[PDB]
Amino acid sequence: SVMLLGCEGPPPGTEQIGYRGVGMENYYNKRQRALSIQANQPVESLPAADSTGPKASEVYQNVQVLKDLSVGEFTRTMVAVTTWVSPKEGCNYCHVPGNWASDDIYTKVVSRRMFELVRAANSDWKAHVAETGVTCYTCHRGNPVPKYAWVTDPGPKYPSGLKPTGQNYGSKTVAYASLPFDPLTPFLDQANEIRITGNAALAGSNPASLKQAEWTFGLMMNISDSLGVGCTFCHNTRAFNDWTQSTPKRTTAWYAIRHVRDINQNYIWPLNDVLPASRKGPYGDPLRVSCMTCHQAVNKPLYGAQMAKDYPGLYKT
Amino acid sequence: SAGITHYIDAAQITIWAFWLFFFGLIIYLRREDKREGYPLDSDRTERSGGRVKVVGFPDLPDPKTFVLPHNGGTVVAPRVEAPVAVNATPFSPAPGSPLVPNGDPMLSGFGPAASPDRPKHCDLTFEGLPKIVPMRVAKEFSIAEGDPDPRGMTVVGLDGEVAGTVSDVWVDRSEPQIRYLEVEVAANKKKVLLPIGFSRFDKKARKVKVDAIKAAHFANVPTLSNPDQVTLYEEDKVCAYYAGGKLYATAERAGPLL
Amino acid sequence: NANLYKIWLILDPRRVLVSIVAFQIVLGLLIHMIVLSTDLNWLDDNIPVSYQALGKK
Amino acid sequence: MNANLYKIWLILDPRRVLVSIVAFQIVLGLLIHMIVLSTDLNWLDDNIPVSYQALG
Amino acid sequence: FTMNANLYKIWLILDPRRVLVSIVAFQIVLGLLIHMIVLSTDLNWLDDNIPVSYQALGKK
Amino acid sequence: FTMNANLYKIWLILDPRRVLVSIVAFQIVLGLLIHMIVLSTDLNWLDDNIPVSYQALGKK
Amino acid sequence: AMLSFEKKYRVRGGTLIGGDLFDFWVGPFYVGFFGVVGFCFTLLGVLLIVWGATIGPTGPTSDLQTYNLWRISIAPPDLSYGLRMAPLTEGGLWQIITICAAGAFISWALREVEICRKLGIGFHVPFAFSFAIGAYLVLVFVRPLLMGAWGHGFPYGILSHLDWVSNVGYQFLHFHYNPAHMLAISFFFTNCLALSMHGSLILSVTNPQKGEPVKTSEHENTFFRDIVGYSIGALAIHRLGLFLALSAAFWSAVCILISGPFWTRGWPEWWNWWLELPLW
Amino acid sequence: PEYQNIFTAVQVRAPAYPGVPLPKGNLPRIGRPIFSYWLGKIGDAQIGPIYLGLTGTLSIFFGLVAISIIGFNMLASVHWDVFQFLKHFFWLGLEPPPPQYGLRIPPLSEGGWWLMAGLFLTLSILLWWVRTYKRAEALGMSQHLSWAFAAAIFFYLVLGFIRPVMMGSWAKAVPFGIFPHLDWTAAFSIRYGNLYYNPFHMLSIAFLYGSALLFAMHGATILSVSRFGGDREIDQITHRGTAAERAALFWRWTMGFNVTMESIHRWAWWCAVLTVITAGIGILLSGTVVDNWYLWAVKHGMAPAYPEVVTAVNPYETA
Ligand code: BCL
Ligand code: BCL
Ligand code: BCL
Ligand code: BCL
Ligand SMILES: CC[C@H]1c2cc3[nH]c4c(c3C)C(=O)[C@H](C(=O)OC)c4c3nc(cc4[nH]c(cc(n2)[C@@H]1C)c(C(C)=O)c4C)[C@@H](C)[C@@H]3CCC(=O)OC/C=C(\C)CCC[C@H](C)CCC[C@H](C)CCCC(C)C
Ligand SMILES: CC[C@H]1c2cc3[nH]c4c(c3C)C(=O)[C@H](C(=O)OC)c4c3nc(cc4[nH]c(cc(n2)[C@@H]1C)c(C(C)=O)c4C)[C@@H](C)[C@@H]3CCC(=O)OC/C=C(\C)CCC[C@H](C)CCC[C@H](C)CCCC(C)C
Ligand SMILES: CC(C)=CCC/C(C)=C/CC/C(C)=C/CC/C(C)=C/CC/C(C)=C/CC/C(C)=C/CC/C(C)=C/CC/C(C)=C/CC1=C(C)C(=O)c2ccccc2C1=O
Ligand SMILES: COC(C)(C)C/C=C/C(C)=C/C=C/C(C)=C/C=C/C(C)=C/C=C/C=C(C)/C=C/C=C(C)/C=C/C=C(C)/C=C/CC(C)(C)OC
Ligand SMILES: COC(C)(C)C/C=C/C(C)=C/C=C/C(C)=C/C=C/C(C)=C/C=C\C=C(C)\C=C\C=C(C)\C=C\C=C(C)\C=C\CC(C)(C)OC
Ligand code: HEM
Ligand code: HEM
Ligand SMILES: [Ca+2]
Ligand SMILES: [Fe+3]
C-alpha cells in the first residue's frame, strides 16, 4: 500500500521482437537470467548405447513400451528413468524387491504410461516439443513427484456456504492479480474456447461475455508466466488476435495448449485410480500438467538443452 | 481521414459531432477570452495566424454587466478604457522594440514595476468592514498558535543591511491569512506596507529578508493614504513597486548574465 | 597553483566548495555503478566470494 | 586572434564565462566518454584481460 | 538499574503527555500485531486442532 | 565514555529533543524491521520448525 | 501589436544568457535568446519530419508510405545501434527530430524565464513546465540509456505512438498494478476533479444568480464548507493544483523510468512483497 | 530567493465563521469547527462546520450502505478472516451477476449484493449531485459544479445503467474493487478491439491531459502573480489590476494569444467537463456499437501500417 521505484538495478535484457520502434520488446534481469540457467541445467546423458543384442520383449517376461530395444540400451533407460526420477529411492521405487516383471506397483503402472507419454509426445507433437523433446528430468527434475503439478484450486475459504466468485484473490497462479486464479482447470484440463476478439469491426458477431475474455486473461497470464515472457513475445498487443500480426511463437503455443489437453485428459488423468490420495486433490483429482510444470519459467525447459534426443526408446515406433 | 472518404458507419458520425461542437465552443471561449484588454493598441505588428482578421476572428462579445457587492458601482465588459501614459522611451523605433523607463525606473512606474489604477476604495468583507486591515482593528485576531509572531521582526534589505522593521501584520476577516506587514522604515520613520508575498521569513534570526529592493527603496515605497485600511487602487500600488526591484534594485539583475 | 590563488575573489566560497562535494558523491556512486554493470562485477560473480553459486546450490 | 582578445573581459564578468565553460566541459567531458565507450572500444567490457572476470 | 538511577532527569526533556499517550498506542498496536502475526502461522489455535471438531464433526 | 571529555560539546549543535525522540523511532523501526527480515527469511523460528507442529498433529 | 495595456510593460532587457540583442517582440511573442533558437529546431523538425512523412516505411514509394496523420509516424532505430547515431532512414532521422524537440522545449522553457523576468513576476510557470519537460526525457532518454538503446525509446506517430505504449506496457502484463502508474494515474484524476471545481466555482461566483452581486470569498470559503464540510481555502486551490499536476507528471515519469531498467517481472508480481509479509 | 508561496509561512486565526446565513428552508448548519496547524500550513486551517439537509442525509445514508455491502461481501470472501482481508485487500472485491441473469435480479448470492450495493451507489451518487445544485444556488450561486458533476456522473452511468444494462449483461458493468476494477478497464480494452483505437477515448485522453495541463498552469500562473493578489481572482474578475496584467501578458509574449482571469477559469471548467463527456462517449459506443475499434480504425483508413519482421500461422485454417 505504498509507492515504489523498481527493486532491480539496470541495465536489463533487450529482445527486439518487433520492427524498429513499434512496441513488442522484452526485458530481463541478467542477474537472474544467469542463475536461472546455472540452475536449470540438464544432467548429461548416459554413455553410448550397445547397439548389440536381440531385443527385450524377447528376453524379458514383460516389456511392452521398450520391446524393440537391445538389452543394454533398454537398461540405459532404467538407469536414466531412475536418476531422472527417483535416484534417492533407487530402482525399488518402480520395482519390487527382486521380481522385476511385477506390475504390483502403481509407480510402475504409470511409469509405463509416462513412457507412452514422453515418446508419443517427442514424436507426434514435435511441432511444440520439436527436437529437444522431453525426458523424465523435465517434470521430475530429480524428484519423483513433479513440484509443478496442479489440482483444480478449491479457492479461498467459504463464507457460511457463500463464496461463488472465483476472480478476486491474488494467487501466484497468475503472476499475481485478482483473476480466476485457476484458468487452467477450465482450460488446460478441459478445453473452453479461448478467442474473444470480435471478427468484424462493428457489432453483430462476437457475443462473448467480457467475463469470458476476463478468463482468457488469467489463462494467458499464467501461460506468459510459465514460459516467462511478456505477452509481447507471442502477441502484437494491439493485435492480440491478428495472427498475421502475431509472432511465430504464438502458433507454436497454440498446439501446446492442446498437447496438454491431451496429456491431462488422456494420461495423467486416467491414472488417478492407481494413484493414492497423497497425489489426489481436494475436489478429488490428479496433479495434471501446467505449461509451468515443464517450462518452469523458461522458453525451452533447461533453455533448449535437448536431453530426450539421446534416448531412442523415447520416440513412438 | 486525411485522404478524403473511405469507410461508412454510425459511430464515426458522432466523432464528427463532438469534434465539431468543439470547434464551436472553442470560439465561444475565444470571445469570452477577449472581454477585457480588448481591442489591441498599436500596429507594431499584425495578427499572427491563419486568417489575419481585423481584430481577432471571434467578433468581440458584448458588454457584460458586473453587479458589484453592496454599496458598489457596477462594472461591465467589454468596457472602453482611457489610454494611459508611457513613462518610457523606445530603445529602438522598430516595432516590438523595448521602452526604457525614463528617469528613475524604480518608480518610473513601468513594466517591471508598472500597474493599473484599480478603484480607490478599500475592498470590504462580507457585510461591510474592509477585508484587508492591519492587526490594529484586526484586534480580534491571534497569531497561529505556534508560528513565531512576526510583530517585531526587523526587515532586511536584499543588500542585507537592515531597512526598518515591522509593526502590524495586515490580516483579513475573510481568510485568517497574513497578507501584509507594517514596516516602520528606518530613514522615513514612516509606514510602508510589506507584501508578505514578497516577504521571505527567517524565523531563526527574527529577520524577514526581502530580495526585492535595496534597504533604501523602502523610502520610495508608495505611501499608504490611511493606515487603518488599504484600497484596491493602492493594493496594486504598493506591490508593483517592490516588483520593479526584481529588475531594478541592481544594474546586475536587469542586464543579461551571458 | 602558484598564481591560482586569485580565483577566489571571483568564485564564491560556499557555492563551489560544497557544489563539488556533491559533484563527487554523484560521480562516485555513478562510477562504481557504471562499471559493475558489465566489466567487473566483483560482487556476486566469483571466488573466494563464491558462497552463493556453490553454497546455495 | 588572441593577440587583441585581451579586451574580452572588459565586457564580461569573471564568474560569467569562468564557470559556464567549466560546466560545459564537464557536460561535454563525460558526454563524450560515454559516446566513445560505446562503439570504438567498449574497453569496459569488450575483450581482455578477462582472466579475472572470466577465469575468475 | 545501573542507569535507571540518574535516568530520572528523563521527564524533563521528554514531554510527559507526548510520551504517555504514545506508548499507549505502540503497546496497543504492537500487541495486536504480535497476536495477529503469531496466530497467523505458528499456532493458529483457532482453526488448528482440538478439543473437538465443531466444524468437521458437527457440520457433517 | 572517554569521548565524553571531548564529546560534551555535541549537544550545543544537536537539539536534545530533535535527537533524543528521533533515535527513539529509529531504534523502534530498525528493530521491528529486523525481526521482520530475519524472521521472514533466515529462520522463521515461529512457524518454521520445532519443537514440532502442534496444530497439525492435533488437528488430523 | 500590443494588448490594451501591454504597451506599458515591454521594458528593455531582462534576458538570461545574453539576448539583449534580439530582445524584442514579433506579433505578441517576445523573442530573446530562446525564442530564436527554439524556432530553428521547430522547422528543422516540423518540416524535417515532413521529410519523414515523405520517406515513410520502406521508401517514399512503398504503398506503405502515406500522408495521413492517423498513420504517418517516424520510427526510432532498431535496438541494434544501441547508443549511437543511426542512419536517418533506419533511425537517425528519428533521433535528429528528437534531437531538436529537446532544445525546442529547453529554449521555449528558458524563453519563458526571460519573460517571467521582464514581466517581473513569479516563475512557478517554467519550473512547472520543466517537470513536463523532464518527463519527456525520462521517457526517451533516462530510460533508453539504462537500456543501452536510443532506438529503444518511442516513435512520433499521431496515434502510432499509442501502440508503442500498448506493447512496452503489456511487457509486464497488467501494467495497471505498477505502484506508480496507480498514483500517477490517481493524480491525473484528482487534478481533473479539483480543476473541474475551482474553474467551476469561480465561474459561479463572478457570474452568479440573476440579479445578484459578484459574490465574495465569504461564500466560496463556505460553498464547500457546506457540501463537503471543509474548504481547502482559495489561495490553496491554486496550490493543490500545481501540486497534483506537477506531481502526477514527475510520478508517471518514475512510472516508466523504473518499468524495465529497474524491474523486469510483470508488475502484478512486484505487488507480492506485500503478500509474503511474515504476518498474514 | 523570494518567498515562493509554498506553505503559508506564518498563520493567524479568528473565530469559527459559519458562513453566510441561509434562507427559509436550509436547516441549521452543524459542527463546532476546528483548527489544524498542519492542514492549515497549506490552506484554510479551519475545519467545518458542514451542512446536512434532506438529500444531505438521505444521500449520505444511501452512501454508507453500498459501502456496508461492497464492504461486507468483500470481507466475507476471505472467510471473515481480516488478517488476510488486510493482505488480499487490494485484490478483493465484489463481482456483478453471472451472464445468465443478464438483467434479472441476481440471487442473494451470485452477483446479487453487487446489483444491490450498486444501485445504492447509483442513487446516493446522483442524490449528492442534488446536495450540490441545492446547497449551491441557495447561496445565491449559479450552477457550474452541479453541471460538471453531471458530465462526470454521466460517464459513471455509461459504466452502468446506460450501457451495461444496455447490452443485457449484469456483467458488462465494472466490478467493485481496486484491482478487479483495475482489471475491468483492462478486460474491456480487449473484449472489444483495443480502446487506443476508439477515438472518443484517445480523445477523452487529451482532455484528462489538458486538465492535467492547464489547471496545472493557471495554478502556477496565479501563484507567480499571487503577490499581486492574483489569488484574489474574484475581484480581478471584476476590477482588474496588475495581477491579470502581468499574468495574461506572459502567455501573450509566450504562446502568443492569451486571455482573462475570467476566461481561463472557463476552459478550466470546460476541458474538465469535456473529459468525462468524451469518456462515457467511447465507452457507450464501445459495446452496442463498434465491437473492435482496431478494425474500425483501419477500416476507416485510420489505423497505421508498419513493415513486418514477424508474422505467424493460423491453425483454424491450415488445420
Ligand atoms: C570498482 C572496482 C573496485 C573499486 C574501485 C574504486 C576506485 C578506483 C575508487 C573507489 C572509491 C571509493 N569506493 Mg570503491 N571499489 C570497489 C568496491 C567498493 C565497495 C564494495 C562493497 O564492493 C564499496 C562499499 C566501495 C566504496 C568506495 C568509497 C569509499 C570510495 C569514494 C566514493 C566517493 O564518491 O566519495 C565522494 C567524496 C566526498 C563526499 C568528500 C570529498 C573528500 C575531501 C577531500 C575530504 C572532505 C573534507 C571535509 C570538509 C572534512 C570532513 C569529512 C567528511 C566530508 C564529513 N567500493 C571495487 C572492488 N573504488 C574512490 C575512492 O575512495 O578513492 C579514495 C576511487 O577512486
Ligand atoms: C576514451 C578512451 C580512454 C580515455 C580517454 C580520455 C581522453 C583522451 C581524455 C580523457 C579525459 C578524462 N577522462 Mg578518460 N578515458 C578512458 C576511460 C576513462 C574512465 C573509465 C572508468 O574507464 C574514466 C572514469 C575517465 C575519466 C576522465 C576524466 C578524469 C578526464 C576529464 C573529464 C572532464 O571533462 O572534466 C571536465 C572539466 C572541467 C571541470 C573544467 C576544466 C578544468 C579547469 C582547467 C579548472 C577549473 C578552473 C576554475 C576557474 C575554478 C574551479 C571551479 C570549478 C569549475 C567549480 N576516463 C579511456 C581508457 N579521457 C580528458 C582529460 O582527463 O584531460 C585531462 C581527456 O582529454
Ligand atoms: C532473531 C532471533 C531471535 C531474536 C533475536 C533478537 C536480537 C539479536 C535482538 C532482539 C531484540 C528484541 N527482540 Mg527479538 N528475537 C526473537 C524473537 C522475538 C519475538 C518473538 C515473538 O518470537 C519478539 C516479540 C521479539 C522482540 C524483541 C524486542 C524486545 C527487542 C528490541 C527491539 C528494539 O529495537 O528497540 C527499539 C528502541 C527504542 C524505542 C529506544 C532506544 C532504547 C534506549 C536506550 C532507551 C530509551 C531512552 C529514552 C530517551 C528515555 C525515556 C524512557 C521511555 C521511552 C519513556 N523477539 C528470536 C527468537 N531479538 C533486540 C534487543 O532486545 O536488544 C536489547 C536485539 O538486539
Ligand atoms: C500499455 C497500456 C497501459 C499503459 C502504459 C503506459 C506506458 C507504456 C506509459 C504510460 C504512461 C502514463 N500513463 Mg499509462 N497505461 C495504461 C492505462 C492508463 C490509464 C488508464 C485510465 O487506463 C491512465 C489514466 C494512465 C495514465 C498514465 C500517466 C500517469 C503516465 C504519463 C502520461 C503523461 O502525461 O506524460 C507526460 C509527458 C510530457 C509532458 C511530454 C510531452 C510535452 C512536450 C514537453 C511538449 C510537446 C511540444 C510539441 C512537440 C510542439 C508542437 C505544439 C503542439 C500544439 C503540441 N495509463 C495501460 C494499462 N502508460 C507513461 C509514463 O509513465 O510517462 C512518464 C508511459 O511511458
Ligand atoms: C504536468 C505537466 C503538464 C504540462 C505542463 C505544461 N505544458 C506546457 C507548459 C506547462 C507548464 C508551458 O509553459 C508550455 C506552454 O504552453 O507555454 C506557453 C507547455 C506546452 N505543452 C505542450 C504540449 C503538451 N503538453 C502535454 C502535457 C503536459 N504539459 C502535462 C499534463 C502534452 C501531452 C501529450 O500530454 C502535450 C502535447 C506545448 C503546446 C507547449 C510547449 C511548446 C513548445 O515549447 O514547443 C516547442 C516546439 C515547437 C512549437 C515545434 C515542434 C518542432 C519539433 C522539432 C518536433 C517535435 C516532435 C514531437 C517530439 C513528436 C510529437 C508526435 C506525437 C504524436 C508522438
Ligand atoms: C472530468 C470530471 C471529473 C470529476 C468531476 C466531479 N466530481 C465530483 C464533482 C464533479 C464536478 C462534484 O460536484 C462532486 C463533489 O465533490 O461535490 C462536492 C464530485 C465527486 N467526485 C468524487 C469522486 C471521484 N471523482 C472522480 C473523477 C472525476 N470527477 C472526473 C476526473 C474519481 C475518479 C474515479 O478518479 C473519483 C473517485 C467524490 C469525492 C464526489 C462525489 C461524492 C458523492 O456522490 O458522495 C455520495 C455519498 C457517499 C459516497 C457517502 C459517504 C459515506 C461517509 C460520508 C464516509 C464514511 C467512511 C467510508 C464509508 C469509508 C469506509 C469505512 C468503514 C469502516 C465504515
Ligand atoms: C500542408 C501544411 C499546412 C503544412 C504546414 C506547414 C507549416 C504551417 C509550417 C510552419 C510550422 C511552424 C513554424 C509552426 C509554429 C507556429 C507557431 C509559433 C505556433 C504557436 C505555437 C503554440 C505553442 C501555440 C499554442 C498551442 C496551444 C493552443 C496549446 C493549447 C493549450 C491551452 C488550452 C492553452 C491555454 C491558452 C490560454 C488561453 C492562455 C491564456 C492565460 C492563461 C493560461 C493563464 O493562466 C492566465 C492567468 C491569469 C490571467 C490571464 C491568463 C491567460 O490569459
Ligand atoms: C458526580 O460525579 C462526577 C460527574 C463529578 C464524575 C463522574 C465520573 C464518572 C461517571 C465516571 C465514569 C466512568 C466509567 C463509566 C468508566 C468505565 C470504564 C470502563 C468500561 C473500562 C473498561 C476498560 C477496558 C480496558 C482498559 C481494556 C483494555 C484492553 C486492551 C489493553 C486490549 C489490548 C488488546 C490487544 C493488544 C489485542 C490484540 C488483538 C489480536 C490478538 C486479535 O491481534 C492479533
Ligand atoms: C465488512 O466491512 C466492514 C464492516 C469492515 C466495513 C468496511 C468496508 C470497506 C473497507 C469497503 C470498501 C469498499 C471499496 C474499497 C470499494 C471499492 C470500489 C471500487 C474501486 C469501485 C470501482 C468502480 C465501480 C463502478 C464503476 C460501479 C458502478 C456501479 C453501477 C453502474 C451501479 C448501477 C446500478 C443500477 C443502474 C441499479 C439499477 C436498479 C435496477 C438493478 C433494479 O435496475 C434494473
Ligand atoms: C537402476 C535400477 C533399475 C533396474 C536394474 C531396472 C530393471 C528392469 C528390468 C530388468 C525390467 C524388465 C523386467 C521384465 O518385465 O521382464 C524393467 C522394466 C521396467 N522398469 Fe525398471 N529397472 C530399474 C529402475 C526403474 C525405475 C527407477 C523405474 C521407474 C520409473 C523403472 C521402470 C520400469 C518399467 C516401466 C518397466 C517396464 C518396461 C516397458 O514396459 O517397456 N525401472 N526394469
Ligand atoms: C499475459 C499476457 C497475455 C495476454 C493478456 C494474452 C491475451 C490473449 C487473448 C485475449 C487471446 C484471445 C484473442 C482472440 O482470439 O480473440 C489470446 C490468444 C492467444 N494467446 Fe495470449 N495473451 C498473453 C500472453 C500470451 C503468451 C506469452 C503466449 C505465448 C506463448 C500467448 C499465446 C496465445 C495464443 C497461441 C493464442 C490463441 C490460441 C488460443 O489460446 O486460443 N499469449 N491471448
Ligand atoms: Ca473480475
Ligand atoms: Fe483560478
* Count of DSSP-assigned helices of chain A: 10
Separate helix tally of chain B: 4
Question: What would you call the structural class of chain A?
Answer: mainly alpha
Distance separating the two termini of chain A = 58 Å
The first-level CATH class name of the largest domain in chain B: Alpha Beta
What is the element string of chain A, with H for helices and E for strands? HHHHHHHHHEEH
Could you give a short account of the major beta sheet of chain A?
2 strands, antiparallel
Biggest beta sheet summary of chain B: 3 strands, mixed
CATH topology of the largest domain in chain B: Photosynthetic Reaction Center, Chain H, domain 2
Indicate the structural class of chain B: alpha+beta
- Oligomeric grouping of the chains: part of a larger assembly
CATH architecture of the largest domain in chain B: Alpha-Beta Complex
Task: Tell the overall outline of chain A.
Answer: globular
Count of discrete domains of chain B: 2
Question: Overview of this structure, please?
Answer:
It is classed as photosynthesis. Keywords: photosynthesis. The entry is titled "Crystal structure of the LH1-RC complex from Thermochromatium tepidum in P21 form". Chain A is Photosynthetic reaction center cytochrome c subunit. Organism of A: Thermochromatium tepidum. This is part of a larger assembly, with 1 copy of chain A (317 residues), 1 copy of chain B (258 residues), 4 copies of chain C, 1 copy of chain G (280 residues) and 1 copy of chain H (319 residues). Chain A has 317 residues and is an all-alpha fold. Chain A is built from 10 helices and 2 strands. Chain A has 2 domains: 29-146 and 300-317, Photosynthetic Reaction Center, subunit C, domain 2 (Orthogonal Bundle); 147-198 and 208-299, Photosynthetic Reaction Center, subunit C, domain 2. In chain A, helix 3 packs antiparallel against helix 9. The longest helix of chain A has 19 residues, at 106-124. Chain A has helices at 30-39, 71-83, 106-124, 126-129, 136-140, 185-189, 210-228, 248-254, 256-268, 291-295, and strands at residues 280-281, 285-286. In chain A, 32% of the residues lie in helices and 1% in strands. In chain B, the strands form 4 sheets. A 3-stranded mixed beta sheet of chain B has the order 6-10-9, with no helix packed on it. Chain B has a two-stranded antiparallel sheet with strand order 1-2. Chain B has a two-stranded antiparallel sheet with strand order 3-4. Chain B folds into 2 domains: 1-117, Photosynthetic reaction centre, H subunit, N-terminal domain (Photosynthetic Reaction Center, Chain H, domain 1); 118-257, Photosynthetic Reaction Center, Chain H, domain 2. Chain B contains 4 helices and 10 strands, in the order αββββαββββββαα. Chain B is an alpha+beta fold. Chain B has helices at 11-34, 105-108, 232-245, 251-254, and strands spanning 64-67, 74-77, 89-90, 99-100, 142-143, 155-156, 180-183, 192-195, 200-202, 207-209. Chain G has 280 residues and is an all-alpha fold. Chain G has helices at 35-46, 48-55, 92-118, 124-137, 142-145, 160-170, 179-202, 217-226, 234-257, 267-270, 272-275; strands spanning 25-26, 29-30, 73-74, 156-157. In chain G, the strands form 2 sheets. Chain G has a two-stranded antiparallel ribbon with strand order 1-2. Chain G has a two-stranded antiparallel sheet with strand order 3-4. The longest helix of chain G has 27 residues, at 92-118. Chain G starts with 24 loop residues before the first strand and ends in a 5-residue tail after the last helix. Chain H has 2 domains: 1-142, Up-down Bundle (Photosynthetic Reaction Center, subunit M, domain 1); 143-301, Photosynthetic Reaction Center, subunit M, domain 1 (Up-down Bundle), CATH 1.20.85.10. Chain H contains 15 helices and 3 strands. Chain H has helices at 54-70, 72-77, 82-87, 112-119, 123-128, 130-137, 145-157, 178-191, 199-213, 218-224, 233-237, 243-252, 263-288, 293-299, 315-318; strands at residues 12-13, 34-35, 46-47. A two-stranded antiparallel sheet of chain H has the order 2-3. The longest helix of chain H is centred in the C-terminal third of the chain and has 26 residues, at 263-288. The radius of gyration of chain H is 25 Å and the shape is globular. Chains in contact: A-C, A-G, A-H, B-D, B-G, B-H, C-D, D-G, E-F, E-G, F-G, G-H. At the G-H interface, strand 2, helix 3, helix 4, helix 6 and helix 7 of G face strand 3, helix 3, helix 6, helix 7 and helix 8 of H. Strand 5 (142-143) of chain B pairs antiparallel with strand 1 of chain H. The complex binds bacteriochlorophyll A (4 copies), bacteriopheophytin A (2 copies), menaquinone 8, spirilloxanthin (2 copies), protoporphyrin IX containing FE (2 copies), calcium ion (CA) and 1 more. One bacteriochlorophyll A (BCL) sits between chains F (20, 24, 27-28, 31, 35, 38, 45) and E (10, 14, 19, 34).
